Amino acid sequence: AQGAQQIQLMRQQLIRQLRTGLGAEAVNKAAEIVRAHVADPQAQSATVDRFLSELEQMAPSSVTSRLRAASRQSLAALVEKFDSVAGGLDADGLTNLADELASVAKLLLSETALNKHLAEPTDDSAPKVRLLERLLSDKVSATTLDLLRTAVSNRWSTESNLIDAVEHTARLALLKRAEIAGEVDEVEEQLFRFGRVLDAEPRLSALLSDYTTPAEGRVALLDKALTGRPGVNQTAAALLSQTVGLLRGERADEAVIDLAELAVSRRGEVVAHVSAAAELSDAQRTRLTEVLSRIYGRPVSVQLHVDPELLGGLSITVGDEVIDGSIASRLAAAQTGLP
Amino acid sequence: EVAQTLTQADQQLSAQGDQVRSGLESSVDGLSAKLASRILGVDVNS
Amino acid sequence: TAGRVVRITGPVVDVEFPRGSVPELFNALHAEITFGALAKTLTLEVAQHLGDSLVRCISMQPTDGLVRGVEVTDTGASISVPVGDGVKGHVFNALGDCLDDPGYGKDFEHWSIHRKPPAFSDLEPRTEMLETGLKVVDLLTPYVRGGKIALFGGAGVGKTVLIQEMINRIARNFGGTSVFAGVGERTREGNDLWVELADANVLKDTALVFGQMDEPPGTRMRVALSALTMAEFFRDEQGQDVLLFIDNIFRFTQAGSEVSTLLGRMPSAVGYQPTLADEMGELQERITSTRGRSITSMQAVYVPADDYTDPAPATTFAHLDATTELSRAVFSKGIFPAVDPLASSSTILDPAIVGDEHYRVAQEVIRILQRYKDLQDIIAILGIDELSEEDKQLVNRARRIERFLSQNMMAAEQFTGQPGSTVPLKETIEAFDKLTKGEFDHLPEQAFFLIGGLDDLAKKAESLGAKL
Amino acid sequence: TAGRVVRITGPVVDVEFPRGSVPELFNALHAEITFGALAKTLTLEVAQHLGDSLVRCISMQPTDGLVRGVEVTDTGASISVPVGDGVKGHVFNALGDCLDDPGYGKDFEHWSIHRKPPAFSDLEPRTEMLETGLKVVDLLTPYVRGGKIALFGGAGVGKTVLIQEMINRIARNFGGTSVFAGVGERTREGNDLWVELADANVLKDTALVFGQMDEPPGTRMRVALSALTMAEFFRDEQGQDVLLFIDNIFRFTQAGSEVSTLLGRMPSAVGYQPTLADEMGELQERITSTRGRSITSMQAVYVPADDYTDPAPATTFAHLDATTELSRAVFSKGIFPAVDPLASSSTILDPAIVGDEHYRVAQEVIRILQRYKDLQDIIAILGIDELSEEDKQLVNRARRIERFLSQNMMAAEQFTGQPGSTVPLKETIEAFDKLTKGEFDHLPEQAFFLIGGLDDLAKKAESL
Amino acid sequence: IEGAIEDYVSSFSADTEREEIGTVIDAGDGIAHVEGLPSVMTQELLEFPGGVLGVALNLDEHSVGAVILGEFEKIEEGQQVKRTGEVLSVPVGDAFLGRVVNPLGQPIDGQGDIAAETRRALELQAPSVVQRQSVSEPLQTGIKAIDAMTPIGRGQRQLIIGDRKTGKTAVCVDTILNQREAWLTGDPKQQVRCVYVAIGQKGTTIASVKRALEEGGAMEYTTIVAAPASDAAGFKWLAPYTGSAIGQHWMYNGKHVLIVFDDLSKQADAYRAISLLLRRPPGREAFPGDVFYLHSRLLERCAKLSDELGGGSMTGLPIIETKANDISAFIPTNVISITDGQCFLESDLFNQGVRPAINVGVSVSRVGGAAQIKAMKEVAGSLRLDLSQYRELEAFAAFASDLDAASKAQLDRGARLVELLKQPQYSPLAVEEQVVAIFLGTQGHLDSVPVEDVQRFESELLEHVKASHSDIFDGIRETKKLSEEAEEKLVSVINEFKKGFQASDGSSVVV
Amino acid sequence: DGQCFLESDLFNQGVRPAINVGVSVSRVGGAAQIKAMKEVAGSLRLDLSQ
Ligand SMILES: Nc1ncnc2c1ncn2[C@@H]1O[C@H](COP(=O)(O)OP(=O)(O)OP(=O)(O)O)[C@@H](O)[C@H]1O
Ligand SMILES: Nc1ncnc2c1ncn2[C@@H]1O[C@H](COP(=O)(O)OP(=O)(O)O)[C@@H](O)[C@H]1O
Ligand SMILES: Nc1ncnc2c1ncn2[C@@H]1O[C@H](COP(=O)(O)OP(=O)(O)O)[C@@H](O)[C@H]1O
Ligand SMILES: [Mg+2]
Ligand SMILES: [Mg+2]
């Protein structure tokens, strides 16, 4: 009986080797076939359309991460104060305010001890206000006085949080002036393209990210190499130059994508980093935006990132949640699914 | 007895696997085509 | 796409790569030391991914002269060693480079030294005695052909002499291939073994892979994997019986623990790495025979400070079919091989395999030696006169038995100046059956010291004035 | 004002609260595990204030299935157990939840398990004897009222029957009650004890609190305090004399060590928690006599490696007043309770506490038994013939004494239908004085099995 | 077999779904830290690319520490990690009998798929203190020493603790083999289903154990959960829980289960490795603060259920390897505290020929006589005192002249009984045969026999009765007691056999 | 390549050099001796151990 066991075991192991091989060559040939079939644009379009239908039939659902309750609430109060006060400010006034805020943030970053003293939480903000107005009233505007007083009065977990709050207020003022000019979409697209190209060439991004080197040289590098171009929005250029000027302990591409995220969130929308092997039709884009908005309720600003490696299909990531329709992902699942 | 049965089983198993490999080769294309057809949500005539 | 060295601390190097170019774990990376005196090419094995595109690597060569920021190249694969019949008769290092003929084997097929062990369904227990001619081994620790044999013991108890003896007795007439892995041992011993194999004409059939105790921890970690890869190729591709000799396997674990804290891992009990059992298990489980494919492996296992409870030998014990445990106490008595018959074990020492008579004689010998061990303290304090008559008779028998388990080995001729001997298993069983029955109680115990069979016993008794 | 989980590492959970809502140390918090298979309400005990509004807590239940960010509710008080007469006859866990009837006692008065010992003034300067009524215990190892008794004994030695006997005597003689604290309790043994107490009809006089083997270390650390809180309510509020059983106290110590390790504290000597003495003292100092009422404790003690100098037993014995060892040898003889009169001891067996007559009688009994034990080996090897005449006389007297230390116990009625006896202390003293003097050596040995005082001895002698 | 793969491909299909993802932020030594996955539970099963599996053990605001259960070398920074929304669980059913599976319930014996009746989470709570009843049914190991001196009941946890090469696996395998007759009975109240968990053993050792079970026909009712030495620390840590889950599925359906853990010390080592790699605080012997909890929650799931829950039971036989016979080490101390009784095996006894090498002086069973049948209770009553007196007197072996008659008789009886408790390997004895052998020993029927012959005598006599006087065994088995008439017939049979028996030295054994 | 174990016990009792023969050993052995010494001292260490 155990000899029968042994011979049946050898037979079954031969069977298993057969199955494993057959499966390996089968999946390889299937990959070749699909890649051959997906070369033509029509297959790409049809895959996108069917996946969009699948998303349409999908049912809806419900759902700054680094900051915490105190810091998040203080920043919310600061942005509300800005919305209230700087609403009537003029575009040139907005640029002046942004420049003053960036200069103040640079001063705080360079002068660590003053940042500590101004950032240490305190129930009574009167001393903080007194020191801030004593040191700044000389070289800032009244609206800047009010914004800085509001920021310092509130609470933050650490000094870096205060620096981030000041930079965020300046960036949001720049975005306010951008929307005032009516080119909000233009700056959105420019920022996203800049982030993508910066991610593509990590060498330049890392070179910029070195805060050890004086920031004037790096911002000049950005101006002459990338930010200085014919088709570059001036507002986006200024925002990116400011962001790189304040870079410290952060990598440039991450900062740029965060800039784009904040800019889109300024209108309340949520960015959906769509990925596909080819650009979609305008009707396809509208359908995608509508279906994603329905799924997540809030309007969604779809951003297309072409990547031929998906072999057709779409991959939509938003808020740490991903719907993966990529054909490459399906092929990987099929391969790993083999016995 | 079991030793002789096992050695003959091994050699005939090698022969059977060898002759099965060719039979598998002539039929893998259809299996791969069906896989690629159903993976894409649409039939591929290839 | 190349990385650059960020941190250098002894054998551990941190390397930063561009996003998306981070090498896979266990990949081989190359760095250059250009300082003239120590110029060389470092091979680094990726040990960890630290995040932010940094990898922590173990260097295979000393990092002296290495500089921060130097280019680091990724080979895209693990460390690989040459495989095939060509490796026979040649000496390699952990990286696969031939030492006797530098440049040899570069064109051979190369196999990665990292491999999964055989599937559980392919494992068949091995139960077949491998007769050696050593009385103690054949009687009380019968070795298994295609099984796993270990020689445990502390420093300087005869592990290497016994490994060389087993080479002489087994590999000298082996019909297959032999692989000797020198893991973190003396270079002088490696040279002596190379010369001995060349003289014995066994080298032609043997592949030697050496990583000495002067190598950095990475080389001592990976040399065993390299030799094991050669053995695995011979088992799975050439389809021939393989002899795998490893000395000393404990050095693999020791080298692993040397870098454990530099790799950031909190130490475990007795200073060992937390992953001792897992790394040992992977390596050991690769050292096995599979159905129809034989690897008779013989490992020397060093017992730190003679402490058999130490986690390294204790963890190793579970991986063996037969274990000859050498004792410092037996060594200090002049008994060689210094085997502790009460502590050694064999999985095939049962009536079903070795037979009723062999098992009976072995059990009787062990019982007598255990009783003698119990009576040692009484004899030391109160003297032997206070023992019962049967206890005195048993003590005499046990002393003669412990002396007779001693044997003059060929590999020991360099020390004793006395030629070795080989005792057939049947003669061993008959002789120890006679001993346990008291058939040799009239001979002086000195007649039983470092001899072969009963003929040698009669000769020595004649030389001492006795006669059987 | 509710917190949220931020970190989970086994039973250790970090919880963040708003600025003004940080719970006090040892407060009980409630989180929820909603995963269907493992759904439960998780109890966390605040162990440290990490700062930045973060607290580190020990989960009283396994955290398997817990998610980061789920709400955590502060209950405003530490672990509180139900008290009152209603806890008698029921089984509770360390958190006060009734196990034999879930939801039972949820409306009772609830007392925090973290309480201070009686104030220095409130303590009784004079140590008092607890007259149990058992001849061996009263004579050789008298118990201290409000003190601590260590219990040692293997399996099948009457340990459970002895516990039942003490429950009976505290319930009947003193009109008191019992609380059993099973620290690191084996579930099988806990079920056995519950069923046996129900069968003995003494469960009504006992409150069982089980912190079982398969719970995280926090519950095993706090179960002793829970049971002690029930006993403290019975003493201070009900004005009763309580008997508190702890099995095993060493497991309370070991759970404390495990919790200390989980919180990252550096281990002290031999790997125990740095505050081992402090924790043991906080537990033991609450067991005492205050304002005319006492909690007496009998505690099973495990000695690691039989090393009495080990930090755990070394700290525990700093608080133990008496020792009672149960012997396989005595039990095999049929002597119940199987107390070892030579290995057992009491700290108050001194003339200054129990008087000179009691001390003299007990010392004479101990001397006779020790001499008999010395002669036991001779008797076993060479037989009683080789013994001297004085040796034979002493052997007979010692056999009669060692058999008169046996007693018909209250808890033994359910086994041997005969009811138990309660020998007054003076009666026991005089009876054993007479036995030692040699005023009963003529009577047969069998007449000394399982009887009370001298009246029962006379009756059993007549019956033979 | 091409049809086999054709069926899978024709049946294979995938569908997109809103998935929560994280990214591997670092990886090393079998651990991976993955950011994201905000809603991941503790102990949730995560899937990394290439079908790699991990368990989320360490959750903080930054990342999730995950133990990778295999193929860790495939883990890479930046890889996408998906949550499964499920804690660790394994399939369970009757199809697992005779199969070898890994700690995930996946067959590793190469005999095809396993039809799972259902799935069971590995961390389902043990039966409560009110869901149990007293352990009162014998679990016959077939080993005379255990069944007489430290009896095991159904639902008990009997630790088998000893140094290496003392016979612990031998004892457990003998128990499993002894369950063969109960299995053949066909009655679920008598049948015992066996689970053998192998942790950290080399694959060939597991193959040898399976071969031994095959020889005795035990694999018809035995399941092996194997986590060999090459497995990841995750599998070594989880295997006992997988075996326990299968056993619990059987236990809650009124069945009786015997689970062996060979051995829990290797599981403790694997868990310590995981905890240290996750930077959890170490304590004594570098173990985490909850290793005792590990083993205690594992072993409290072995229970005897009440009749309200079907009355099923699971008996645990954890194995512990001590070093230098130091039972006061950390893990031996914990497991000894947890279990109901302990069988201490010793190398010195083994080398003395005392096999199984159980030290009856220290071996205990807190359940005790409640787990024995009435006959065994009667015959085994005197064994404890007899052996204790024998060990007391053994110092006087050569001085029997100096000993009074009672002491010399005690010494001779003790030697006879020590020989009686000896048993060959792979030879479980039925309870009736054990009763008869112990009766021989304790009733003075071995006094006339030479010591060195006792064993053979015993065996031969047992073969005689079974051949000619099987009514004695019948009576004992059906009634579970030794009747007066059966006892008299047994005495007469013993005396006649003694008439027929011949000692090794040749002297008669009569009277 | 071997060691000479010096013991204070042997030194005190007059054995100077206090080499503990039972545990002291040379891993080169006879190769490190001239032929005459190897001839007259082949088993000396084992003889003193015994
Ligand atoms: N009753 C017995 N009679 C004879 N030999 C036995 C007996 N029990 C076990 N042995 C033998 O003793 C040796 C050790 O047995 P086993 O491997 O079961 O023990 P162990 O303590 O589990 O060992 P390990 O540490 O290797 O896991 C084996 O050779 C086994 O055959
Ligand atoms: N069979 C033997 N006969 C005589 N001497 C021996 C024998 N085996 C070992 N020795 C002595 O003990 C020393 C230690 O042996 P070796 O095996 O090289 O060390 P280790 O046991 O540490 O590997 C040898 O160099 C030799 O001098
Ligand atoms: N006074 C007594 N009379 C009759 N039987 C007793 C007496 N004391 C103890 N026993 C018996 O001894 C056994 C002791 O077991 P148990 O009560 O569980 O204590 P332990 O936990 O020490 O074993 C009981 O089963 C009981 O039957
Ligand atoms: Mg050596
Ligand atoms: Mg084993």
- Best of E40, E59, E377 to substitute, by most chain D Cβ atoms within 10 angstroms, is E59
DSSP D89: T
| Resolution value, angstrom units | 2.6
Report the distance separating Cα C454 and Cα C432, nearest Å: 10
- A→C contacts (Cβ < 8 Å), by residue, are 9-10, 13, 202-203
Residue E162: partners with Cβ closer than 8 Å, 6 or more residues away: E168, E320, E321, E322, E325, E343, E344, E345, E346, E347, E357
Residue D20 labelled as part of a binding site: no
Q: Please indicate whether, in this complex, the C-beta atoms of D383 and E42 are within 8 angstroms of each other.
A: no
Residue written as tokens 């070289």?
A139
Determine whether D185 is an active site residue: yes
The C-alpha of E304 sits at a distance from chain D's nearest C-alpha, in angstroms, of 8
Residue C457: partners with Cβ closer than 8 Å, 6 or more residues away: C404, C431, C440, C443, C447, C448, C451, C468
**Residue C182 CB–ligand 2 contact under 6 Å:** no
Which residues of A are less than 8 Å from E20 in CB distance? 320-322
From the list D88, D115, D172, D186, the catalytic residue is D186
CB C243 within 8 A of CB E192: no
Report the distance separating Cα D211 and Cα D227, nearest Å: 10
Nearest to D38 among E87, E296, E328 (CB): E87
Phi first, then psi: give them for residue C228, nearest 5 degrees. Answer: -65, -35
Determine whether D159 is an active site residue: yes
Report the distance separating Cα C27 and Cα C24, nearest Å: 6
Nearest CA to E39 out of C170, D66, A5 is that of D66
What is the CATH number assigned to the segment(s) E1-90?
2.40.30.20
Judge whether A13 is closer than 8 Å to chain E, CB to CB.
yes
Tell me the domain boundaries of chain E.
1-90, 91-375, 376-500
* Region label for E11, one of left (φ > 0), alpha (ψ between -120 and 50) or beta (otherwise): alpha
The 3-state secondary structure of C417-467, one letter per residue: CCCCCCCCHHHHHHHHHHHHCCCCCCCCHHHHCCCCCHHHHHHHHHHHCCC
- E→B contacts (Cβ < 8 Å), by residue, are 2, 5-6, 9-10, 12-14
Residue C88 labelled as part of a binding site: no
Residues D382, D388, D389, D395, Cα dihedral to 10°: -60
Q: Would you give the end-to-end CA distance of chain E in angstroms? A: 72
From the list C40, C186, C360, C392, the catalytic residue is C186
Report the distance separating Cα C369 and Cα C101, nearest Å: 51
Q: Tokens standing for A42?
A: 């029509």
User: CA dist E464 to C212, E66, E231, E499, Å?
Assistant: 65, 62, 49, 13
Q: Which chains would you list as touching C if contact means 3+ CB atom pairs under 8 Å? A: A, E, F
How many angstroms does the Cα of residue D155 sit away from the middle of ligand 3? 9
- Sort A106 into a burial class: Cβ within 10 Å, 0-12 / 13-18 / 19+: middle
Q: Please indicate whether, in this complex, the C-beta atoms of A13 and C121 are within 8 angstroms of each other.
A: yes
Report the distance separating Cα A67 and Cα C119, nearest Å: 50
- Experimental technique used? cryo-EM
Q: Name beta bridge partners: D3.
A: D72
The C-alpha of A259 sits at a distance from chain D's nearest C-alpha, in angstroms, of 27
Tell me which residue has its CA closest to atom 10 in ligand 2. C158
- Best of F19, F27, F39 to substitute, by most chain C Cβ atoms within 10 angstroms, is F27
Report the distance separating Cα D138 and Cα D158, nearest Å: 18
Nearest CA to D297 out of D276, D271, D322, D274 is that of D322
**Residue E242 CB–ligand 1 contact under 6 Å:** no
The C-alpha of F7 sits at a distance from chain C's nearest C-alpha, in angstroms, of 14
Q: Which chains would you list as touching B if contact means 3+ CB atom pairs under 8 Å? A: A, E
User: CA dist C13 to C30, C64, C252, C274, E76, Å?
Assistant: 12, 12, 20, 21, 18
Q: Does domain E376-500 have CATH number 3.30.565.10?
A: no
Which residues of D are less than 8 Å from E368 in CB distance? 155-156
Query: What is the residue type of C296?
Result: T
Rg (chain F; Cα; Å):
12
- Sort D66 into a burial class: Cβ within 10 Å, 0-12 / 13-18 / 19+: buried
Which residues of D are less than 8 Å from E365 in CB distance? 155
Q: Are strands E256-262 and E341-345 parallel, antiparallel or unpaired?
A: unpaired
Closest residue on chain A to C119 (Cα): A13
Q: Would you give the end-to-end CA distance of chain A in angstroms? A: 29
Prior bond of E356 cis (ω within 30°) = yes
How many angstroms does the Cα of residue C249 sit away from the middle of ligand 4? 11
* Region label for C346, one of left (φ > 0), alpha (ψ between -120 and 50) or beta (otherwise): beta
Report the distance separating Cα C247 and Cα E237, nearest Å: 31
Which residues of B are less than 8 Å from E9 in CB distance? 31, 34-35, 38
Report the distance separating Cα C271 and Cα C266, nearest Å: 9
Q: Name beta bridge partners: D326.
A: D153, D339
**Residue C350 CB–ligand 1 contact under 6 Å:** yes
How many angstroms does the Cα of residue E172 sit away from the middle of ligand 1? 11
Which residues of E are less than 8 Å from C371 in CB distance? 352
Residue C157 labelled as part of a binding site: yes
Query: What is the residue type of D274?
Result: P
What is residue D93's three-state secondary structure? strand
**Residue E356 CB–ligand 1 contact under 6 Å:** yes
Report the distance separating Cα D61 and Cα D45, nearest Å: 11
**Ligand found nearest the CA of E364:** 3
User: CA dist C191 to A156, C105, C198, Å?
Assistant: 69, 21, 11
Task: For the beta carbon of residue D37, count every other beta carbon within 10 angstroms.
Answer: 15
Tell which atom from ligand 2 comes closest to the C-alpha of C409. Answer: 1
Task: For the beta carbon of residue C98, count every other beta carbon within 10 angstroms.
Answer: 18
Q: Does F contact D via 3+ CB–CB distances below 8 Å?
A: no
Looking at the annotation, which residues of F are catalytic?
A: 27
Which parts of chain A fold into alpha helices (H)? 2-37, 41-57, 69-85, 91-110, 112-119, 126-136, 142-153, 159-181, 184-200, 202-209, 215-222, 234-245, 252-265, 282-296, 327-337
What is residue D57's three-state secondary structure? strand
* Region label for E165, one of left (φ > 0), alpha (ψ between -120 and 50) or beta (otherwise): left
How many angstroms does the Cα of residue E424 sit away from the middle of ligand 1? 11
Tell me the domain boundaries of chain D.
1-78, 80-347, 349-464
What is residue C146's three-state secondary structure? coil
Q: Are strands D293-300 and C3-9 parallel, antiparallel or unpaired?
A: unpaired
Task: For the beta carbon of residue B9, count every other beta carbon within 10 angstroms.
Answer: 18
Report the distance separating Cα C204 and Cα C86, nearest Å: 10
From the list E297, E366, E456, E477, the catalytic residue is E366
Closest residue on chain D to E326 (Cα): D305
Nearest CA to E304 out of E184, E152, E194 is that of E152
Nearest CA to D227 out of D83, D432, D51, D443 is that of D83
Q: Name beta bridge partners: D110.
A: D82
DSSP code string of D306-336 = G-TTSHHHHHHTTS--EEEEE-HHHHHTT-S
Give domain E91-375's CATH architecture: 3-Layer(aba) Sandwich (3.40)
DSSP D176: -
Judge whether A325 is closer than 8 Å to chain E, CB to CB.
yes
The 3-state secondary structure of A31-94, one letter per residue: HHHHHHHCCCHHHHHHHHHHHHHHHHHCCCCCCCCCCCHHHHHHHHHHHHHHHHHHHHCCHHHH
The C-alpha of E468 sits at a distance from chain C's nearest C-alpha, in angstroms, of 29
Q: Tokens standing for E128?
A: 């409560």
Q: Tokens standing for A337?
A: 């699914």
Closest residue on chain B to A13 (Cα): B13
CB C22 within 8 A of CB C49: yes
Q: Tokens standing for D25?
A: 């140390």
Which parts of E46-111 fold into alpha helices (H)? none
Judge whether A61 is closer than 8 Å to chain E, CB to CB.
yes
Query: What is the residue type of C71?
Result: E
Report the distance separating Cα E501 and Cα E454, nearest Å: 11
Return the number of CB contacts < 8 Å for A and E.
Answer: 64
How many angstroms does the Cα of residue C42 sit away from the middle of ligand 4? 29
Q: Tokens standing for C62?
A: 């000393």
From the list C165, C185, C325, C445, the catalytic residue is C185
CB D242 within 8 A of CB D235: yes
Q: Does E contact F via 3+ CB–CB distances below 8 Å?
A: no
For residue E410, what is the enclosing H or E element? Answer: helix E405-421
How many angstroms from the chain centroid is the CA of residue C187?
Answer: 16
